[PDB]
């Protein structure tokens, strides 16, 4: 959880 | 896995596949610059490209093998040289401007309008012209950005190590196929990683007064701007 | 022209071109301060850039450059020849650091001055690196004459500055040349030199880093006034900074 | 100039 976490499982 | 039995060829086509596009820029050429509207346009354009960069990455041979921390851990640190590489590079054929957008090509003194900023200007037009007498190529360019990438951080050692093998194996075939003497594969190949070096410094220079170009406030950066300039320092 | 050199010659030429090994004042009679420990390793340096400016007018080539361009390399420089120094030193201490033979410093003695252990951390590692690849002294000496030669090159005006940038390349490609020689001698495969050279090479890009974060809390400390900088090392910051 | 001057000695 963190920005650029999610942008990478989306 | 698989990602190291990709033959030298279709890592090339794999990249250029890859290849994020060229943005423009939220730019009013009516009103002159500043501190504030300088930072206003780039923050805007490394915003977006930002998003095509994580993207990108993915596509990069080997990378989604990595455990989450990993991809995020390496993007947090490459991301600016990134940016950066892929800048000098669109600002080849412009000697003495950098092209940051096809809409937003810049000359040197317009850097100083943003303290610290002209320094980093002066750097990159200097990588941008050494990109021109060595006439780096598209495919080599993209093989740079691999590597960026893959070392910026730097079995779970191994693999990124093995697949940055791969890369220089590739790097080579491209050398080999311009027809290029043993002699002169090495020390192109020398002369390229050295490059590195110097976008490494620069991503440093522009990180130290941007974490400062945020305390002193003059314009807002994005939550992930924040978020990748705060776990970088 | 130092080009018209062979390998050897080139190997040789560095070798015994190599700074000596210092001491660190000795027999500390004081605990570890932040103000301590900067006042050791400051004292170290500005005495190890005396020795570093003999060092570099012995680089083959070197000396063919005019005063400002060898002042802008070593400005450049100073502080990744250093560390490329200091980890080579620490070799074979695994998990420690050898500033000096009596300074050997593990990392739990960097947990007071701001930044240290960070820093460290990435020397130890680069330590691992080199012990796991098996870094050569005849390969060491190639790296650190190119860190001098490669940080500040880019960092033109007239043929003069041009030329001038043509003849290092030259330099650097020699070292390229005497490194791959080195790797063959060794008897290693053509495709393992030039993954080797590879790997080598972009190292210098980790320790580019090392200085840059050095640099920075080199800078913090200064103007917090922790310890007193030496006039050369006061020079060799403000070229950072400007 | 500290650094100028000590590549100056011969
Ligand atoms: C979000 C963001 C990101 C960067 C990298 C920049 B800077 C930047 C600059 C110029 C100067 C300072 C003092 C700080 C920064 C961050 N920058 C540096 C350069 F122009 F000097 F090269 C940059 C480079 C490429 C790119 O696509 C977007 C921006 C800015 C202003 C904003
Ligand atoms: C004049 C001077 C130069 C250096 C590189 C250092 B530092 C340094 C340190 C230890 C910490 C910080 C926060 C900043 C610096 C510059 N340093 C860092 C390391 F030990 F963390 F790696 C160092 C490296 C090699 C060498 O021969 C001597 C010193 C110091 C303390 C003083």
Redesign the pocket.
């Given at each position: 959880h963190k920005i650029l976490h999610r942008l990478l499982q989306d | 896995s698989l990602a190291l039995s990709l033959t030298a060829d279709q890592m090339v086509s794999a990249l250029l596949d890859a290849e994020p596009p060229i943005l423009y820029s939220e730019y009013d050429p009516t009103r002159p610059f500043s501190e504030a509207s300088?930072?206003g346009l780039?923050?805007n354009?490394?915003?977006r490209?930002l998003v095509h960069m994580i993207n990108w990455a993915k596509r990069v041979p080997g990378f989604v093998d990595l455990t989450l921390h990993d991809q995020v851990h390496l993007l947090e640190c490459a991301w600016?040289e990134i940016?950066?590489i892929?800048?000098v590079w669109r600002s080849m054929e412009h000697p003495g401007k950098?092209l940051?957008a096809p809409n937003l090509l810049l000359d040197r003194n317009q850097?100083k309008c943003?303290?610290?900023?002209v320094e980093?200007?002066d750097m990159?037009l200097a990588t941008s012209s050494r990109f021109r007498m060595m006439n780096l190529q598209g495919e080599e360019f993209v093989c740079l950005k691999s590597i960026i990438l893959l070392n910026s951080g730097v079995e779970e050692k191994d693999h990124i190590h093995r697949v940055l093998d791969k890369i220089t194996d590739t790097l080579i075939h491209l050398m080999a196929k311009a027809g290029l003497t043993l002699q002169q594969q090495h020390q192109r190949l020398a002369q390229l990683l050295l490059i590195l070096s110097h976008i490494r410094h620069?991503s440093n220079k522009?990180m130290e007064?941007?974490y400062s170009?945020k305390c002193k406030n003059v314009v807002p950066?994005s939550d992930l701007?924040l978020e990748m300039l705060d776990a970088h320092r």
């Open positions: - | 300088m930072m780039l923050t354009l490394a915003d490209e600016l940016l950066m892929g800048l950098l940051f850097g943003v303290e610290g900023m980093i200007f990159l620069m522009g007064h941007l170009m950066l701007l």
